[PDB]
Structure formats: C-alpha cells, structure tokens
Design a binder for this molecule. Structure first.
Ligand SMILES: Nc1nc2c(ncn2[C@@H]2O[C@H](COP(=O)(O)OP(=O)(O)OP(O)(O)=S)[C@@H](O)[C@H]2O)c(=O)[nH]1
Lengths: 527, 263, 292
C-alpha cells in the first residue's frame, strides 16, 4: 500500500553542460549517423554540428557564420531577428569611420569611402564590418553607385582572412555587384600587390576590370569626383601635404625598381615611378611607413644606405645620390617623435564577464561571510545575479529582495551553496579553485577559514579534469596542487585545520591519489 | 578550560579537538539529587561563554566544534540557552556580549533545527503569556520586558534559511509579530521588520514545502509590497532608508500606535 | 527716472515676446547682445539684470535659433587666435551673463521643443565656453563662474534628447576631459568639486570612451589608458572621501554612480583594471563595486 501511494500519481542549461553534450555528439558523429539511418533529423544535426565546428578549439570571442549554406536572405533575417542594429559595437564601428557614404560623382553616383587601414584583423570586426556595409549600402545598391578604396598604410594587420574574403562575393545580391559603376583604388602598395598575388582566384572577377580606376596621382581623382564631393580622411590628405620630394630613387631588392621618396613630418612615402601589374592593370605603387614604424636608421654611404622598418626580415636598401639628406630628414623627425612619444605601458588581457564565471563566484562567496551586513546584502545580490544570468542550476534556492537581514554566522548557507554548485556545475572548477587560492593570501583569518570551508566541496571534481585527453588541463591540476603545497608551507597558522580539511578530503578519493603522491615526491625533492 | 587560556593557538585548536567528545556526558551529571554538581555544570557553561566572548581569532572554530556539538544533545539545550539569557541579561543590550550571543544562537541551532526553534518560540510564548498574572498598561514597563527583547534578537538571527522552522512553526511566529509590531525602540522595530522579511523570504525559497508556481508568484508580490515605504510607516519605522542597516547599528517610542495599521 | 526704466523693460519684453511674428529682428537681437555688457553708470546694473530676466525667461521659442548663432560669433571673437583666449573684464561679464541665459532658457522646458532642435549646434559654443573658463584662474569669482558652468552642463545633459549635435559622443568626451581637471574658500572649492561630480556623472551616462585621435598604438590600448586614468582619479577621490560629513556622504554617493556608469559603458576595456578591488581593504569600496 505504501508503494501504491507513491507510485500512483522553460529553463536553459549552462554553457558547460551543452559543451559536454556537443563533445558527446561530435566524438560519435559517424556512428549516430549509421544508427539514425538504421532522415531529416540526422541532416539537421549534421549541418548544425558543422556550423558549431568539431569540439571547442577556438576563443569564443571568435565566432563566424560559416559557408555551408551562406544565403543572403538568411543572413539578413538573422541580423534583423537579433536586432544587431541596437548593439553598442555597431555604433562603435560607426565611430571607427569605415565605409562611410560621401559625395556624388560626376556621373551622378553617390560614393562610398572604404578605409582599409582603420580595420584590424579580427572576427567581430569583420562580421560587423560586412553587416555595416550591407546596411549603409542598402538604400543605394538598387541604383548605380561608386566606391573609393583608400589603401594608405595597409599591412598584414588589416588583411581579410581567406574565409572572410570569400564572404564578400556571396552575401550581396548580384545587382549590388552590377550597379558598381567604378571602383577608385587609391594609394595601392606592394603589400596589397602581394595580397592579390596570393588571391587572384577569388579576385578573378576584378582581374582586368575597367571599373577599377587606379588613382595613381591625387589629381586623377579630380577627373571623376569633384573636390567638394571628395571627403577623404584628414590624415590621408595630410599624408600628401608638405612632402620633401627626392626623385631618382632606387629600391635594391630581388628586383631593383625606380621609386621616389617623399618625406613628410609624420611618415615616409616611397612611390613607384614604374608601373607594375595589379588585377591586370599597370599602376604606380606607393608604400607608406609611419614614423612610429621606423625601426633603425643608418647610413652605409652617401650613395647607398639601408633603412630598417619594424616587423621586417631585412632592411630596405636605398641607392640615390642624396641618401644622406634623406637619412637626416627621416632621422630628425623620427628622433623628435621618439622624444614626443610616451613610454611603454604593460597591458592586461581583455576581460568580459561571460568568460570569467569563476572569479565572480569567488568575489561573491568570500564576501558573503564578511562582518558588515551591507556587504552581505551586496554579496547576496551578486550571488542571485550570477545564478540567474549564467543559467547555473541552483534548484530554486535564491531570490533577490531588499531589506534582507543576513546573520554574521551564515557559513552553513555558504557551504550548501558551494556544494550544490559543485554538484550541478563542474566545468569551472579550475578557475574557481585558482582564484580561491589567490584570494586566500589577501584575506583575514576568519575569512581564511571560510575560504577553506567552501573550497573543500570542489576538490572531488578534480578527478574529471585530471587524466583528460587535453594535457594542459592535467598540467593545470598539478599546478593547483603546487600552490596548495605552497600555502601549506607558508601558513604555519591554521596548519591543523589545513591538514584536516584540504589533504583530509584529498586522501579520501581513490584514483586521484597517484598524481598527489607524485607531486609530493617531486616537491619534497625540491629544497 | 583552565589550561585553554595559556596554550598557543596551534595547541588551542587541538585543545578544542579533544574536549569536544567529553561534552556529551554532561547529561549524566545533570538531573541528580545533588545540585552542587549542577551549579558547577552551569559554572562550566559560564566559562565556555566567557571564552567565546573573550577570543576573536578562533571564534568560528569555537562556534562549530563546541556549540554545534552541544546542539546535538537534546537534554542540555535548555540549561544551555537559559544561561545565555542570563548572559544576555548580563551587561547591556547593544554591547559586544549581546551581539556575539546573538550570533552564537544560530551556531547552536545549526546542528539541530526543529528542537532549538521549538524551545525558543516556546519561551517567547510563555514570557508573553505570563504578563497576564502581573498586568501592566504597556509591555515596556513590564518586568519581563527584557526577555521579550532579548529573545526577539534570537529570532532575527535564526530566520535566514529555516533556522526557525517555518514549515511547522508559522502560526506562533506570526502571533509574536502581531504582539510586537511597533513596540520598543528603533532597533527592535527594525528587527521585527527584518524578521517579517526573512520569514517570507525563507517561505518562498525552500524546497521542503514544494509550493505551486502561482503561490510563489503571490508570495513574491507580497515580499515586494512589504518592501514599500508604506509598510515602513505601518511598522513604525520612519525616516530610515534601510531597516537592515539600523538593525545592527549599535555594532557599527514617541510615535503613537494606531490599530488600523495593525489591521 | 524709474518710470522710464519701467516702460523701457516693458517694451523690451514686448519686443522679445512678439519677435516670433518677425531683417530688423537681427538688429534688435544684436542691440540686446550689446546691452548685456552695457556698463553705463547708475542704470546699467539693473539694465543687465532685467536683460538677464527677459531673454532668459520670455524670449519667443522661434527666436531661439538666431540668438545662439549670434552668441557663438561673439565668443568666436573672444579667442584671440588659434585657440588662445584674450581675457577682458567685459568678456568675463559677457560670459557670466551668458551662462545664466542658457541656464534659464534650457530649464524652462515649455512647449515648442522642436523649434529648439532643428537648428541648434550649441556644441562649439560650450566648447569655447569651457575653454575660456578653464584659463580664467583660481579665485572666488572664478570659482563661482566655474560652478555655474557645472550646473549648466548638468542641465543640458538632462535635456540631451531634445537637442542635436554634429558629433555627440566626441563632444561629451571632450567635455569630460575638460571637466575632470577641475576635481582637485576651500568651502567653495569643495562646492565646486561637489557640483562638478554630478556634472561628470551626467556626462558619463552611456558614453563609450573615444581616445583623442592621434596615430595611436591602437584603439583598444588608448581606450584602456583613458579608462585607467579616469578610474585612478576617481579612486583617489574616493580614498580622500573614505576618511561636513553630509557633504562627504553626497560626494561618495555621486562618485559611486560615476564608477557605475563608467564601468557600464566600457565593460570590455574595463573589467581588467578593476576586478582586483573585489578584495579591497576598505569595505565601502568593496560594497560599492559589489553592486556595480
Ligand atoms: N556555421 C553556420 N551556421 C549557420 C549558417 N547559416 C545559418 N547558421 C546557423 O544555423 C541556424 C540555421 O540552421 P539551418 O539548419 O540552416 O536551419 P534553417 O535555417 O531552418 O534551414 P533548413 O535548411 O535546415 S530547414 C541559424 O540560426 C544560425 O545560427 C551558415 O552558413 N553557417
């Protein structure tokens, strides 16, 4: 009858559990395909898995729509559906001033100015770039329009990745490509020529294109766009003004070429005096080197010297009758920039809250047991917020309110919270334990005992991240044990409690023992 | 206890560690015909209280190992907690002794919840009820007022996560609140407000009761409406932005009462 | 003679009232701008006072365009050459009147907001204003001018939805850089700092930090540098506050909001320099960050 009584009668999981599911799917992809064949389901899963990739192998900062279907209609509905119009990064990219509409051509076509150098190689930079181009270009690609590609100072930092470069030729409609009346390519350099030499295949539609008008002299732009309709960037124009011109220059390379050197107060522009082939057309190249990029300045002789630029294998060898005047002209402004520039500053890793769940749990739980009741209230607010937004499974034991009076002796509550999290969410133990060890050294005594008391439920999860296929993770495990040795040695106080809790719980778990003893052997030998 | 004063901290932890098995046999030495041993037992408990209030560094280890162990055994509890009352009668309210005793109250009940909560609410009910035999116009001038005050603090620290068991002791717990709405100084009124908030908070955030969803919705609404300043003025607390801040303000009667607010 | 002044202010207010019907109106407005600094003996004082009232409070909203432009031109002549300013007492009195004029004109907030917006680029006007006031010096009257400018900036941030700028974020960023030099007689000095704090708070509301355009190491590096500078200045201020108690309490309360806004804007370049005071010694900082 007792068994008869019992027998008769919206939530999104965390990232790590989905990641484990994704691992289980990907590692057994072919076999689940065979069993599902024993039809739309396997297919849907198949493309989905591909869109995701094989299991995590990349920084989540980087995510890219792939090309398995790559249809314009989809891309637009995806961007409109999630309201990418509203995100602050889009307004930031508008502030970067790339691909801004400006002016109307002599043929009556509005003109779009793409500045290549303001772009840095990166994923969100690229995809927000292409969606910004699609949004700005959208009123106007139904009609004929013209574009100007400013290629000043473009280096490998401004390149398009091959997959990203393939995106530009598929996501726009055909009449968007067809309405392009003319493409004015301005200040093309040798690096762009190299980039085209690596990428003739995708740029074969531009190969020999008469719509590519190369503005090899700045006055040639006045032949197609009125100067009042010209709105090129101010630094680009300042690159042309007050230039100290030295003709009869030669670049000594594998191929020695005829160039001219124009030295301006911020930079050095070497303009090729002989035409070379880019995209099927013979042009005058001009390589631009900022004063901030010059590495070493020296004079081999009055008729010949070598100039060293940063991130170059070899210095460029320059032969001219006036090499000495060029060297002094470069070196004066370069040294006054050297005086003008500030010193080096060390910089830290970019931190965004959705990739640091461990540190925020530590700053919450540690302060939850502090003395000041206001601090306990604030800690309760963060603990509720973290358990809400990051979608950890807490089984509904948290709720936010104002006016809650928290006792000073709430350590059982903290331990219950940490144990429930260690049960329902094991994927952040490494950063959590590491930050807990780090916050130990900067904590008060009662807080130190608290830190021990809520870190001890997590230690049983180290079996999962030990002996894993990735060796970096078991390396992290051994490193954590190294800091545990370090804190045991350094803190002579709490030493019975430290041994009672940390090593006491550690010894109780078989199959984790061997790495612990091996660490013991290597660290006892040390000293 | 005598030797615990002079040893070092590393020795002190182990000193705790071997006294803690012996405390269970005090139930043997209580309830005997000779009460000289009983007064000595109370003196020992006074020494434990003295060491708890005297020491700051090993305070959490003390609170766990001694007091949570005493909370395990049923029979000692009363003659333990009664002593606390005299301890809380000792000295003054809003002092170090009173506050650390308020914290030690929940450490006592952490090991065993239902029985300790039962004892505390039973003594609140009895000290309320005994005022009838010596009636006074107001509770503040009554002689057993302090036991009303002191145990009130005990209910504040013991209401965070069902430390006062809400699943079975809600009627008595509401009844005390009704009899203590806006009586006494600012601290006790703010403590009463915090008690009400913690009662509702633990009422919704516990898996023992397994309520329905709509019930959780209306309780969530009720918590918000008690957070309103209108209910501050109902509870007698005015001009104070945060009740939780002045609930503990000593660490860091002029307004009349109207029965419609009680309604 | 006070009767003559009575009908004089009467006609001045009447003309200011019916300029909306509408050029001679520009000549009328130029005569007003000349008469703001009318320093004639025995009348000019009350004259300018009355002027500060009328164009302050009763100017027709459709006459809002012209006035702004004319003032701009006047302060464009205030700068001697190339951003350098020339200091005359007449210019000082012009500035002092002008501040209260836009203060009242903004704060009235009557109907007719559209007639305020479609034409007005008060961006350059205020930029010139703060650039002249910053070089005034440090003394009692100068402090009074500075703090009045601070309430003006607070107001025109409060009305940011109505107005229009050519580049809003660059303007606000330049305003922040100009204002935060003023953070550090004393009673006044503390009052100046007090008002400057809500000025900076109102400026920081949803402001992505833009580095001043040099060549730059990169956008992210200089954004980190500006974040570090502003954050260190605010932490120094709050550390001085951590030790007139109501004044310090309000100063703490607004500096907390400054941290909250400045972190809420640039989280990307911003957690990495201020996740390490979640273990801070003072519990006030720890609590503040701990709800931020
Ligand atoms: N990697 C990658 N992901 C894509 C691509 N297109 C869409 N996605 C992602 O996958 C989702 C679409 O999955 P998909 O299988 O195409 O469903 P669908 O759009 O309904 O199309 P269907 O043909 O399967 S019925 C989108 O929401 C987006 O997240 C693509 O080209 N590459």
């Amino acid at each position: 009858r007792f068994f008869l009584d019992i027998a008769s009668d919206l939530s999104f999981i965390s990232d790590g559990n989905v990641l484990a599911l994704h691992r289980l799917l990907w590692n057994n992809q072919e076999k689940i395909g065979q069993y599902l064949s024993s039809r739309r389901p396997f297919d849907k899963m198949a493309t989905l898995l591909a869109y995701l990739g094989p299991p995590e192998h990349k920084p989540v900062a980087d995510t890219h729509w792939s090309s398995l279907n790559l249809t314009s209609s989809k891309f637009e509905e995806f961007m409109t559906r999630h309201q990418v119009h509203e995100k602050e990064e889009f307004k930031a990219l508008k502030t970067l001033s790339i691909f801004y509409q400006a002016g109307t051509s002599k043929a009556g076509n509005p003109i779009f100015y793409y500045v290549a150098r303001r772009f840095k190689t990166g994923q969100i930079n690229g995809d927000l770039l292409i969606y910004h181009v699609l949004l700005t270009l959208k009123p106007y690609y139904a009609k004929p329009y013209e574009i100007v590609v400013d290629l000043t100072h473009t280096g490998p930092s401004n390149r398009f990745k091959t997959d990203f470069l393939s995106k530009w030729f598929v996501v726009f409609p055909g009449f968007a490509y067809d309405n392009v009346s003319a493409v004015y390519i301005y200040n093309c350099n040798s690096w762009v020529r190299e980039y085209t030499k690596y990428h003739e295949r995708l740029l074969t539609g531009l190969k020999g294109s008469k719509r590519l008008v190369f503005i090899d002299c700045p006055g040639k732009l006045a032949e197609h766009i009125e100067h009042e309709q010209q709105k090129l960037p101010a630094a680009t124009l300042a690159l042309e003004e007050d230039l100290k011109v030295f003709h009869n220059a030669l670049k000594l390379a594998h191929k020695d070429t005829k160039v001219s050197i124009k030295v301006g107060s911020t930079a050095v522009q070497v303009t090729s005096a002989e035409r070379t082939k880019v995209l099927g057309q013979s042009v005058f190249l001009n390589d631009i080197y900022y004063a901030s990029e010059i590495e070493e300045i020296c004079l081999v002789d009055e008729n010949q010297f070598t100039l060293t630029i940063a991130n170059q294998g070899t210095p460029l060898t320059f032969m001219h009758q006036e090499c000495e005047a060029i060297v002094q002209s470069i070196i004066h402004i370069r040294t006054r920039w050297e005086l003008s520039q500030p010193d080096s500053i060390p910089q830290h890793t970019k931190i965004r809250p959705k990739d640091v769940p461990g540190t925020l749990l530590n700053i919450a739980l540690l302060n939850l047991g502090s003395s000041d009741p206001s601090l306990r209230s604030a800690a309760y607010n963060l603990l509720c917020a973290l358990t809400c937004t990051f979608n950890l499974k807490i089984e509904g034991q948290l709720l936010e309110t104002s006016g809650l009076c928290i006792p000073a002796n709430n350590t059982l509550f903290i331990v219950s919270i940490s144990k429930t999290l260690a049960a329902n969410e094991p994927h952040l133990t490494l950063e959590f334990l590491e930050e807990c060890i780090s916050g130990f050294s900067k904590s008060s005594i009662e807080l130190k005992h608290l830190c021990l008391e809520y870190m001890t439920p997590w230690l049983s999860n180290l079996v999962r991240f030990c002996k894993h296929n990735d060796d970096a993770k078991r390396q992290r495990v051994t490193a954590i044990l190294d800091k545990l040795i370090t804190m045991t040695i350094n803190e002579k106080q709490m030493y019975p409690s430290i041994q009672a809790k940390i090593w006491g719980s550690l010894g109780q778990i078989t199959d984790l023992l061997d790495v612990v003893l091996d660490s013991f052997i290597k660290t006892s030998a040390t000293g | 206890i005598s030797g615990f004063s002079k040893s070092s901290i590393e020795l002190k932890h182990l000193c705790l560690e071997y006294m803690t098995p012996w405390l269970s046999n005090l139930v043997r030495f209580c309830k005997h015909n000779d009460d000289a041993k009983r007064q000595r037992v109370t003196a020992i408990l006074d020494k434990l209280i003295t060491m708890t209030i005297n020491e700051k560094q090993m305070y959490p280890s003390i609170q766990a190992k001694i007091w949570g162990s005493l909370g395990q055994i049923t029979d000692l509890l009363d003659v333990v907690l009664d002593s606390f009352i005299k301890t809380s009668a000792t000295g003054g309210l809003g002092s170090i002794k009173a506050e650390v005793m308020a914290d030690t109250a929940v450490a006592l009940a952490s090991g065993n919840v239902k029985l300790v909560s039962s004892k505390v609410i039973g003594r609140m009910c009895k000290i309320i009820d005994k005022t009838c035999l010596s009636p006074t116009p107001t509770l503040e001038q009554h002689l057993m007022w302090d036991d009303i005050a002191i145990l009130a603090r005990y209910m504040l620290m013991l209401s965070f996560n069902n430390s006062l068991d809400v699943a079975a002791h809600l009627p008595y717990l509401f009844h005390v609140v009704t009899f203590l709405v806006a009586t006494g100084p600012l601290s006790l009124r703010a403590s009463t407000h915090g008690l009400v908030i913690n009662i509702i908070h633990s009422l919704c955030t516990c898996s023992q009761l397994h309520f329905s969803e709509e019930t959780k919705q209306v309780l969530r609404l009720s918590l918000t409406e008690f957070s309103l300043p209108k209910f501050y003025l109902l509870f007698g607390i005015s001009k104070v932005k945060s009740a939780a801040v002045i609930a503990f303000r000593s660490s860091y009667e002029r307004e009349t009462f109207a029965l419609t607010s009680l309604e | 003679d006070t009767d003559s002044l009575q009908e004089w202010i009467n006609m001045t207010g009447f003309l200011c009232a019916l300029g909306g019907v509408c050029t001679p109106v520009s000549k009328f407005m130029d005569r007003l701008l000349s008469l703001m600094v009318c320093n004639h003996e025995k009348v000019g004082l009350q004259i300018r006072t009355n002027v500060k009232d009328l164009v302050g409070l009763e100017l027709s909203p459709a006459l809002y365009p012209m006035l702004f432009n004319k003032l701009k031109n006047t302060i464009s002549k205030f700068f001697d050459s190339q951003g350098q300013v020339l200091l005359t007492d007449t210019n000082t009195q012009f500035v002092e009147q002008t501040i209260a004029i836009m203060k009242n004109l903004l704060d009235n907030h009557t109907e007719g907001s559209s007639e305020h917006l479609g034409q007005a680029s008060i961006e350059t006007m205020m930029l010139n204003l703060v650039r002249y006031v910053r070089v005034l010096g440090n003394m009692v009257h100068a402090i009074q001018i500075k703090t009045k400018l601070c309430q003006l900036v607070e107001v025109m941030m409060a009305r940011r939805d109505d107005l229009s700028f050519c580049q809003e974020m660059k303007f606000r960023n330049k305003m922040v850089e100009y204002l935060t030099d003023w953070v550090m007689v004393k009673c006044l000095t503390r009052d100046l700092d007090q008002a400057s704090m809500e000025a900076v708070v109102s400026l920081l509301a949803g402001l992505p930090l833009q580095p001043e355009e040099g060549d730059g190491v990169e956008l992210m590096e200089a954004k980190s540098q500006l974040f570090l500078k502003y954050f260190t200045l605010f932490m120094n201020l709050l550390n001085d506050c951590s030790e007139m108690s109501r004044r310090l309490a309000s100063l703490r309360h607004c500096t907390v909001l400054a941290m909250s806004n400045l972190l809420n804007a640039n989280v990307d370049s911003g957690l990495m320099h201020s996740i390490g005071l979640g273990y801070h010694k003072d519990l006030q900082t720890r609590a503040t960050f701990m709800e931020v």
